[PDB]
């Protein structure tokens, strides 16, 4: 039994779905571990690293894939329809576990029905105390939560932290977080370890306890509390956004009304630009400054943390499938009434299973 | 049911103990308890006892919770464990100070099929000679379920916030 | 009496020798205080803010100098060789205050000569305790400090702070800071910060009780030879090749361990000290990070290249030129500030005139040259 890893092709994508660690208990279950060359360029591991944990090395995706029993990757793999039939390189009959965006991307499941793979989409993970291990969705926005902050404090033109000095006292920088969710929280965290004074908002009573819990303040007091956003965010320095709702666009927290109101040398670090952003100025993959407002909205921020993102992601794939390796006879049986084997699983056998999916 | 306990009764515990783990959890960074809670920790080390922090890697509400509040008030790494390399010691512990957790600890995630923290590994504090918890009420953790560790034999609870309590049980040391 | 704030033309310069603040104790004193047009932009600092301060805004550079009898900037005026002229902006006999790197720049000496001006550099502070709040360059270089970790966090690929997490633990990073001044000091308050552990390392011995406090490591290297290493005005010495290879060594146990290295290190009148060689680089992880601070000087690193981030061996190391100005909205007003601190004293109150003590040590150590005559010897 094969398991292969492959390099990510995606433009910006510097993830790899292993580690060295995980590579030893992959071994230590019986799989023979197989990675594509440079594939762990981008998270800092390098093919030497791999093969000290048990790995072998394919000098092409293709070799990696040929064989394999199990296939791991982090995004979607392309279609041809994309210009590179990345699942054509996948074995027919073989599982596939990876961050799909099936229920986005009907066409990359189809295709690999096609060649009868069974695929489990990690982001369909029931949330449930158990699999909190498995969970790509909180190990990978956590990391995006403190880069959002990592990203605020390189483009802002003052120190985080509040100096008092022989020439002079110069103050903290204020933050303000939209949306408190697993980023959010994070986000906080750093922005006000760093020093800085933050204030957060979010719809979620519950949450309120949760950003004071980091010592941050809610935004608190006729559904117009917009007032109360308002009057902070005239005084904030960086504002992080990070309020999305799976399927739908992300909804719009800071309008351009709102950013002409904004301090210049502000900026607003924008986490839902993949969703159509927070903020509207906010544009994929660039820095916009409009009104002396820099707005960023980075693609793929897990991605600029892909060295730890990486053995997390990893990890996330080896507590999934762990617990279906029976060594009595070296394979892997996915149990069907595991609620995190029927919830993940998209397509299997030649046929779409999921409810979400099916004709 | 329940065997409660005091500020007072807490301390004489700590103090004439070998060994003490510090079991953090979300109702510790409500609080915001961190400072005193290492404060303590001075305390008992001054005394010649063993303290250590037992991390579930899902305590607080967010990854890394208990580590950036105890960063804060500025406990050594060294002091700090995750749960794999710290389970086996409650065994050699005299007492579990568990200081907001709750779900953490509960046995029913390996005893009970049906409940919701099934499966969930947890800090096996019920392995030490006596466990202290600390929380306002009978109030359940995010999970929604009772712990069966509160009316343990062996268990003492002490009812109020995290802060005040940790605050006041420093009182009674020396 | 005019004193005149022009904007910053060099490349990459974003920080003004103004704030409102510092205008407001301006006009207290009896300036007129004209600010060029714009020229807070890249500080943050606006020309309504500048205005409501009591100053006047002026169309261009030429405007605002014209009338000024002194004159405030952050770096030295550019010569007609440079590409402008801002030396001939500035009125004949006007006194000059700035970051004017007179040592290593004799040619806007004369110039500023040539007309008559008289030039306070303001480099040149001399190393008293009164002397701190006019102190250019630890005000910047303590921001410069702060903007490495941010900087190093930034190209890093990975999470300063330890986080044990569902998924497993993200250890913590592991900082090396080579040179423990001012601009050290700030970076290991600010890796701590952030949650990383932080190691660091000097010649001089006071620094060892420093960096313990702000909760580092220290790494011995050579107790003895540590003793006799500062200075009169607090800074080290050529240590040689044989003291070089000790601390290399005992260095290496880290460095193998470290993701970001952050070094700082100067010596003056000379190029800065090597620490970290190509070699010691081969030996670094993957995806490390080094934030070579003394690039200007030469690098403590010899891969480091101004103005740029090379990559080699798999180890980003950055060497971004001006890194004050990479916080210039915090480095411009206590840059304002310390030219402040330095003109108060010196303002002859009911005359409304600027009367520069030649006896203050303060006066005579700064300045360059004086109504068409270089006074400091060099
Ligand atoms: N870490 C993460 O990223 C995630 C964690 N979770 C879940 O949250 C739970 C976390 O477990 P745990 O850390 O034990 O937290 P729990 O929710 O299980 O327990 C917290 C306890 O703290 C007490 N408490 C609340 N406020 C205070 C206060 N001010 N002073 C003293 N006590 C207080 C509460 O009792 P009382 O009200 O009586 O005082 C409660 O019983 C797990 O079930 C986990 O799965 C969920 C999502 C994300
Ligand atoms: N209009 C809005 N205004 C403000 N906040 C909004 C809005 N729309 C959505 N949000 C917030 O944006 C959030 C952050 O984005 P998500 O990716 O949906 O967060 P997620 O991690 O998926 O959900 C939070 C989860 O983590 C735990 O803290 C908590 O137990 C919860 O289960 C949520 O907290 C949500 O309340
Ligand atoms: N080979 C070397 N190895 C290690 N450190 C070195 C070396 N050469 C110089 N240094 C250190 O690099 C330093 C940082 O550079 P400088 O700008 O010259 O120092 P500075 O910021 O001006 O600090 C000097 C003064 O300020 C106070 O912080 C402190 O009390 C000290 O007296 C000094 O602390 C110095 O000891």
């Not at chain 1, 933050?175 to 965290?189: P, T």
């Not at chain 1, 509390?225 to 719009?252: S, W």
């Not at chain 2, 070998?18 to 400072?35: L, N």
């Not at chain 2, 700090?80 to 409650?90: A, M, R």
């Amino acid at each position: 039994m094969k398991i292969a890893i492959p390099k990510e092709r995606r433009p910006g994508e510097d993830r790899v779905a292993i580690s060295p660690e995980v590579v030893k208990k992959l071994v230590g279950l019986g799989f023979e571990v197989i990675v594509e060359q440079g594939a762990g360029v981008g998270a800092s591991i390098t093919d030497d690293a791999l093969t000290a944990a048990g790995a072998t090395i394919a000098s092409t995706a293709a070799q990696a894939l040929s064989q394999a029993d199990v296939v791991w990757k982090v995004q979607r793999p392309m279609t041809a329809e994309e210009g590179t039939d990345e699942v054509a390189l996948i074995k027919e009959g073989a599982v596939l576990m990876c961050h799909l965006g099936a229920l986005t991307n009907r066409p990359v499941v189809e295709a690999l029905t096609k060649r009868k793979i069974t695929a489990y989409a990690m982001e369909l993970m029931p949330r449930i105390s158990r699999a909190q291990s498995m969970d790509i969705l909180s190990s990978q926005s956590n990391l995006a939560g403190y880069r959002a902050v990592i990203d605020g404090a390189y483009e802002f033109a003052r120190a985080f932290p509040m100096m008092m000095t022989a020439a002079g006292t110069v103050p903290p920088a204020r933050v303000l977080v939209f949306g408190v969710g697993v980023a959010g929280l994070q986000a906080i965290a750093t922005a006000k370890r760093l020093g800085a004074v933050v204030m957060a908002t979010d719809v979620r009573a519950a949450t309120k306890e949760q950003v004071e819990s980091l010592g941050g303040k809610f935004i608190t007091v006729r559904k117009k509390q917009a007032e109360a956003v308002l009057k902070e965010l005239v005084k904030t320095d960086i504002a992080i956004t990070t309020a999305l709702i799976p399927g739908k666009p992300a909804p719009v927290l800071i309008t351009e009304e709102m950013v002409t109101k904004m301090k210049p040398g502000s900026v607003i670090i924008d986490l839902a630009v993949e969703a159509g952003g927070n903020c509207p100025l906010s544009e994929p993959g660039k820095i916009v400054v409009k009104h002396g407002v820099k707005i960023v909205g980075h693609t793929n921020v897990p991605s600029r943390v892909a060295a730890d993102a990486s053995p997390l992601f990893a990890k996330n794939l080896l507590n999934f499938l762990t617990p279906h390796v029976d060594k009595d006879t070296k394979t892997l049986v996915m149990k069907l009434e595991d609620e995190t084997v029927s919830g993940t699983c998209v397509t299997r056998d030649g046929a779409i299973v999921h409810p979400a999916l099916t004709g | 049911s329940v065997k409660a306990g005091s500020a007072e009764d807490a301390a004489f515990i700590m103090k004439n103990a070998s060994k003490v783990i510090i079991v953090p959890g979300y109702g510790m960074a409500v609080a915001q308890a961190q400072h005193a809670l290492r404060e303590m920790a001075d305390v008992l080390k001054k005394e010649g006892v063993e303290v250590s922090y037992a991390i579930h890697p899902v305590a607080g509400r967010m990854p890394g919770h208990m580590n950036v509040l105890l960063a804060e008030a500025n406990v050594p790494y060294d002091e700090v464990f995750e749960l794999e390399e710290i389970n086996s010691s409650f065994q050699t512990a005299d007492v579990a100070f568990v200081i907001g957790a709750n779900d953490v600890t509960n046995p029913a995630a390996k005893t009970d099929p049906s409940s919701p923290i099934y499966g969930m590994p947890i800090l096996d504090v019920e392995k030490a000679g006596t466990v202290l918890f600390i929380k306002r009420s009978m109030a359940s953790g995010y999970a929604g379920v009772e712990n069966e560790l509160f009316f343990r034999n062996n268990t003492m609870m002490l009812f109020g916030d995290a802060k005040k309590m940790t605050e006041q049980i420093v009182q009674a040391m020396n």
